[PDB]
Structure formats: C-alpha cells, structure tokens
Design an enzyme around this catalytic site. Structure first.
Site, PDB file in Angstrom:
ATOM      1  N   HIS A 167      38.486 -66.043 121.823  1.00 24.55           N
ATOM      2  CA  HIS A 167      39.773 -65.231 121.567  1.00 24.55           C
ATOM      3  C   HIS A 167      40.877 -65.848 121.280  1.00 24.55           C
ATOM      4  CE1 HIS A 167      37.235 -61.482 122.459  1.00 24.55           C
ATOM      5  NE2 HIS A 167      36.747 -62.137 123.348  1.00 24.55           N
TER       6      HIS A 167
ATOM      7  N   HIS B 120      31.981 -67.605 122.610  1.00 30.00           N
ATOM      8  CA  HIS B 120      32.875 -67.182 121.676  1.00 30.00           C
ATOM      9  C   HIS B 120      34.270 -67.204 122.362  1.00 30.00           C
ATOM     10  CE1 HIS B 120      32.074 -63.539 123.827  1.00 30.00           C
ATOM     11  NE2 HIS B 120      33.470 -63.251 123.402  1.00 30.00           N
TER      12      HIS B 120
ATOM     13  N   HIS C 177      34.621 -60.398 113.989  1.00 29.00           N
ATOM     14  CA  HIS C 177      35.308 -60.306 114.877  1.00 29.00           C
ATOM     15  C   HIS C 177      35.844 -61.497 115.445  1.00 29.00           C
ATOM     16  CE1 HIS C 177      32.678 -56.518 114.609  1.00 29.00           C
ATOM     17  NE2 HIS C 177      34.067 -56.031 114.350  1.00 29.00           N
TER      18      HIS C 177
ATOM     19  N   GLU D  18      42.599 -62.971 126.712  1.00 34.89           N
ATOM     20  CA  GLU D  18      42.365 -61.555 126.946  1.00 34.89           C
ATOM     21  C   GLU D  18      42.998 -61.254 128.616  1.00 34.89           C
ATOM     22  OE1 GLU D  18      38.387 -60.654 125.764  1.00 34.89           O
ATOM     23  OE2 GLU D  18      39.799 -59.556 124.251  1.00 34.89           O
TER      24      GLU D  18
ATOM     25  N   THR E  95      34.835 -56.536 126.438  1.00 35.37           N
ATOM     26  CA  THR E  95      36.015 -56.491 126.000  1.00 35.37           C
ATOM     27  C   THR E  95      36.261 -56.157 124.350  1.00 35.37           C
ATOM     28  OG1 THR E  95      36.598 -58.447 125.410  1.00 35.37           O
ATOM     29  CG2 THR E  95      37.035 -57.927 127.618  1.00 35.37           C
ATOM     30  N   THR E  96      34.851 -55.752 123.843  1.00 31.81           N
ATOM     31  CA  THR E  96      34.677 -55.321 122.424  1.00 31.81           C
ATOM     32  C   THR E  96      33.852 -54.118 122.471  1.00 31.81           C
ATOM     33  OG1 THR E  96      33.173 -56.965 121.723  1.00 31.81           O
ATOM     34  CG2 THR E  96      35.423 -57.480 121.449  1.00 31.81           C
TER      35      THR E  96
ATOM     36  N   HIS F 183      34.785 -67.450 126.357  1.00 20.41           N
ATOM     37  CA  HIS F 183      33.832 -66.631 127.117  1.00 20.41           C
ATOM     38  C   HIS F 183      32.352 -67.063 126.913  1.00 20.41           C
ATOM     39  CE1 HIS F 183      36.629 -62.853 126.798  1.00 20.41           C
ATOM     40  NE2 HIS F 183      37.161 -63.631 127.812  1.00 20.41           N
TER      41      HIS F 183
HETATM   42  C1  LIG Z   1      26.220 -59.117 122.170  1.00 19.55           C
HETATM   43  C2  LIG Z   1      27.413 -59.631 123.114  1.00 19.55           C
HETATM   44  O1  LIG Z   1      27.500 -60.517 123.475  1.00 19.55           O
HETATM   45  N1  LIG Z   1      28.611 -58.715 123.123  1.00 19.55           N
HETATM   46  C3  LIG Z   1      29.806 -58.749 123.532  1.00 19.55           C
HETATM   47  N2  LIG Z   1      30.710 -57.737 123.698  1.00 19.55           N
HETATM   48  N3  LIG Z   1      31.557 -58.298 124.399  1.00 19.55           N
HETATM   49  C4  LIG Z   1      31.772 -59.324 124.866  1.00 19.55           C
HETATM   50  S1  LIG Z   1      33.104 -60.041 125.984  1.00 19.55           S
HETATM   51  N4  LIG Z   1      34.494 -60.047 124.765  1.00 19.55           N
HETATM   52  O2  LIG Z   1      33.313 -59.235 127.040  1.00 19.55           O
HETATM   53  O3  LIG Z   1      32.675 -61.439 126.289  1.00 19.55           O
HETATM   54  S2  LIG Z   1      30.290 -59.997 124.607  1.00 19.55           S
HETATM   55 ZN   LIG Z   2      34.991 -62.262 124.663  1.00 20.57          ZN
END
Ligand SMILES: CC(=O)Nc1nnc(S(N)(=O)=O)s1
Ligand SMILES: [Zn+2]
Length: 257
Positions: free
Chosen positions: A93, A91, A61, A103, A195-196, A116
């Site tokens: 996006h 990470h 992802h 986002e 957000t996932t 993020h």
């Molecule tokens: C294990 C973990 O960190 N999961 C997450 N899921 N969504 C995230 S987010 N897009 O809001 O930063 S982080």
């Molecule tokens: Zn994120």
C-alpha cells in the site's frame, strides 16, 4: 465498483459493505503511550525457508505476489497466535507522496508505504473458510520509509513494468520473502479486519515496530502502475490506502517494553 477515487473511495464503502462501520475495523492509529506491554506474548516464529513464490499479479487495487499454500512451506507461528498460519500472498500500500501511503499510523505518523504478508489458519482447510472466522487470518504489517535502497525488494521492482495494468500477471518464482524483513521482530498486535472489501473482521494484526528502508527510486516505480486495464484511460495506482478507523472496544498490545 469500489476503489480509491473521490467517487468510489473508502468513505463510500459502507454502502455496499456495511461492516465498514463495524466494531473491529482496520487499520488504526497505534498510540505508543496507550499500548499495553504484555509479557505473556511470545516471540514471532517466521519460517520462510521453504517458501515457493509463483507469480505476481496486478488486481486493479495493488499488486500481489502469490505463493504455493498447498502445504506448510512458509508459515507464521508464535506471537499472539494459536496454531499454524500459511503465507498465501503479499502486497503493498503506498502513496502519491513520501509523506503518506501506510494504512496503520504510529502516533499519527504516516509512512511511505506498508507491506502486508497475509497468512491463513490451517485449521480451517482453505482461505475462503478462514476469512469467515474471527481467528482466520494473521497479517504481518511492515512499514516502509524512504532512505537507502532495500536489495531484497529490487526483484519485485524490476518486474512491475510487465504487470502495469489490471489483470496482467507474470511468472515470479524463487523469490525469498526473508529479504523484506527488518532486523527486529518486536511488534504490536490487535484484532482487526481486512482493509479492503469485503472488510471481514477475521484478522489478527501483527505490526512490526521497525520499518525497513527503500530508496526513492524504488517507491517511484510503484507509482507507475495503473488501476485501469490496458486500453483504458490511464489512472496511476497511488494512494491505495484506507485511513485509520476508530479503535472502539479494543486494546493494542506490545511485545516490547
Ligand atoms: C484474498 C486477500 O488476501 N484479501 C485481502 N483483503 N484485504 C487484505 S489486507 N489489506 O487487510 O492485507 S488481504
Ligand atoms: Zn493490505
């Protein structure tokens, strides 16, 4: 089987994760004129001096840089937070074009990417317990705009070739996340979610006002990654962002006038 395609994308998520249509979903559009300046908000305290990065992984992802969160080495305090939050991973996006990728949006403006930095509230013992609480996580969001290169991001960019496909990981030690921060730490904050999927509503979002700049070459390398695993038909990892969700009964607060 969720993803970012036409047959498994964000508009579909609610079928497996009904919370997708919840009351405090993220991301959202930040309307700068309706945001409320809160003079009671304290400055952010980012202590990343002792951060210990360990690896980098392509999870199908996005790509995550993981840190050792077994002790208070890299923590976030202050701001609208009560307590200490440990950095576990970061990470990004990003989009297929420079005009999209973030986002969150600012007055409907989309940035090329969004970083993020995920932290969890230590009062809950472990990440898994934290995500089940309304104040379990704190995610620091930083926008990326295309312009001059960001020296501190090059180390990440150069290793991407080694984790091109889903499931691939590589040792990634001694990376200092301080090199990814903008000059100012002014921010907006609001209660939201991941957000996932599972889209849990356990996040206190802290979105920085000042974007960082990265070069076209740097972001182009992000777009060379694959959603698929090795040996499978190639699907470029691009546009892995969720569109803005309704704000509903929430107020966005600003730390600056
Ligand atoms: C294990 C973990 O960190 N999961 C997450 N899921 N969504 C995230 S987010 N897009 O809001 O930063 S982080
Ligand atoms: Zn994120």
């Amino acid at each position: 089987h969720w993803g970012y395609g036409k047959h498994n994308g964000p508009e579909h998520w609610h079928k497996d994760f009904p919370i997708a249509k919840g009351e405090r979903q993220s991301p959202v559009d930040i309307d700068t004129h309706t945001a409320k300046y809160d003079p009671s908000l304290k400055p952010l305290s980012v202590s990343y001096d002792q951060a210990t990065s360990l690896r980098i992984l392509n999870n199908g992802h996005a790509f995550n840089v993981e840190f050792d969160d077994s002790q208070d080495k890299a923590v976030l305090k202050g701001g609208p937070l009560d307590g200490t939050y440990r950095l576990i991973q970061f990470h990004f996006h990003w989009g297929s074009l420079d005009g999209q990728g973030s986002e969150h949006t600012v007055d409907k403006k989309k940035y090329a990417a969004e970083l993020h930095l995920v932290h969890w509230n230590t009062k809950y013992g472990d990440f898994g317990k934290a995500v089940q609480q309304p104040d379990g996580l704190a995610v620091l969001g930083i926008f990326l705009k295309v312009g001059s290169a960001k020296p501190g991001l090059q180390k990440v960019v150069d290793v991407l070739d080694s984790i091109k496909t889903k499931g691939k990981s590589a040792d990634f030690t001694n990376f200092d996340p301080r090199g990814l921060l903008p000059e100012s730490l002014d921010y907006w904050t609001y209660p939201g979610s991941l957000t996932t999927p599972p889209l849990l509503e356990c996040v206190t979002w802290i979105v920085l006002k000042e974007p960082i700049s990265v070069s076209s070459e740097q972001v182009l390398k992000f777009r060379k990654l694959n959603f698929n695993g090795e040996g499978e038909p190639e699907e470029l990892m691009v546009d892995n962002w969720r569109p803005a969700q309704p704000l509903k009964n929430r107020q966005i607060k600003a730390s600056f006038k």
